[PDB]
Amino acid sequence: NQALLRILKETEFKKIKVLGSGAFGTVYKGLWIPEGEKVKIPVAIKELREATSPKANKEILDEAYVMASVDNPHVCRLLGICLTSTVQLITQLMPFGCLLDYVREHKDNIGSQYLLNWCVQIAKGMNYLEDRRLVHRDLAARNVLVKTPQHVKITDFGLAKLLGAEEKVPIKWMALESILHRIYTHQSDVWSYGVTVWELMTFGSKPYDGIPASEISSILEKGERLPQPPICTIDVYMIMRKCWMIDADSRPKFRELIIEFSKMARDPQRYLVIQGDERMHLPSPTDSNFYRALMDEEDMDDVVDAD
Ligand SMILES: *CCC(=O)N1CC(n2cc(-c3ccncc3)c(-c3cccc(NC(=O)c4cn(C5CC5)cn4)c3)n2)C1
């Protein structure tokens, strides 16, 4: 559906500040000025790294129209595109930033209810991508954005597919088959999900810290995996370990991860042990209503509360 992707002209928007970057390009906070209006509307803009040609631009545009249909409350939707000598992708601006920076800044202030609800939401967004037959290829805590502390969304999915580069590097998030054979499936996205859950449970620790990328395949072949985070109980750790099994079909499915983490979120102190957890509950209905009115009016399934 062509109505889901807006083609933007360089004159109606401006990049104003750098927000960060990745393997695909630099991210900016921008301002959109609708034609004839005096308002400046904040947007997020990703400017892709490699310069592009008119032939490549037509193929990218065709793929972008399909990519703009990827609609779920836990996945950031591509809203607009500007195709000139560079490819610029426009999306809604998330003022809280990525979940990786969030868990680091609010470490020893985040409770089990939040940690477990973020795992559920990420699995929901990943299950929706699997329902759309779209392999993410770059799932990590840096690619989970915070709309509000209660609502996270996945970004940067299928960027190789958008560019027509699926058959052409975040080694520490990759399944062993992706490292060895560049094979990417919904099951290698499950391995990346286990690493992302590990990043959240360690409040943003670096996976395999100190170990060079070239040594990772050999470490995985010897059966070594990321260590049990100090807050995880054995049941949570066993789910992460199942995500990192050599046999891809032995890993859990995203629909099963939604069910297990939803069950755990219903008795959160039994699955995660955090000091001072009794005073780090989910917001009351009053606070939740206020956050939504000011920055999150979109439709979304209820957050899992404790029994
Ligand atoms: C904290 C980690 C970090 O620094 N990162 C940079 C990367 N990131 C953040 C954003 C962002 C910030 C704030 N508000 C919103 C987003 C982005 C980002 C910006 C614009 C566009 C995108 N992605 C896409 O447009 C896009 C399109 N697809 C489909 C066509 C394939 C997938 N992603 C991301 N990036 C995290």
Swiss-Prot record:
Changing residue 7 to A: Abolishes phosphorylation. Changing residue 20 to A: Found in a lung cancer sample. The modification N6-(2-hydroxyisobutyryl)lysine is found at residue 46. Changing residue 48 to F: Found in a lung cancer sample. The active site is at residue 138. Changing residue 88 to R: Found in a lung cancer sample. It is found in: Cell membrane; Endoplasmic reticulum membrane; Golgi apparatus membrane; Nucleus membrane. Changing residue 91 to M: Found in a lung cancer sample; increased kinase activity. Changing residue 162 to Q: Found in a lung cancer sample; constitutively activated kinase with higher levels of basal autophosphorylation; more sensitive to gefitinib than wild-type. There is a cross-link at residues 17, 38, 55, 58, 168, 222, 253, 263 (Glycyl lysine isopeptide (Lys-Gly) (interchain with G-Cter in ubiquitin)). Changing residue 20 to D: Found in a lung cancer sample. Phosphorylated on Tyr residues in response to EGF. Dephosphorylation by PTPRJ prevents endocytosis and stabilizes the receptor at the plasma membrane. Dephosphorylated by PTPN1 and PTPN2. Monoubiquitinated and polyubiquitinated upon EGF stimulation; which does not affect tyrosine kinase activity or signaling capacity but may play a role in lysosomal targeting. Polyubiquitin linkage is mainly through 'Lys-63', but linkage through 'Lys-48', 'Lys-11' and 'Lys-29' also occurs. Deubiquitination by OTUD7B prevents degradation. Ubiquitinated by RNF115 and RNF126. Ubiquitinated by ZNRF1 or CBL at different lysines in response to EGF stimulation; leading to recruitment of the ESCRT machinery and subsequent degradation in the lysosomes. Belongs to the protein kinase superfamily. Tyr protein kinase family. EGF receptor subfamily. It is linked to Lung cancer: A common malignancy affecting tissues of the lung. The most common form of lung cancer is non-small cell lung cancer (NSCLC) that can be divided into 3 major histologic subtypes: squamous cell carcinoma, adenocarcinoma, and large cell lung cancer. NSCLC is often diagnosed at an advanced stage and has a poor prognosis. This is Epidermal growth factor receptor. The gene is EGFR.
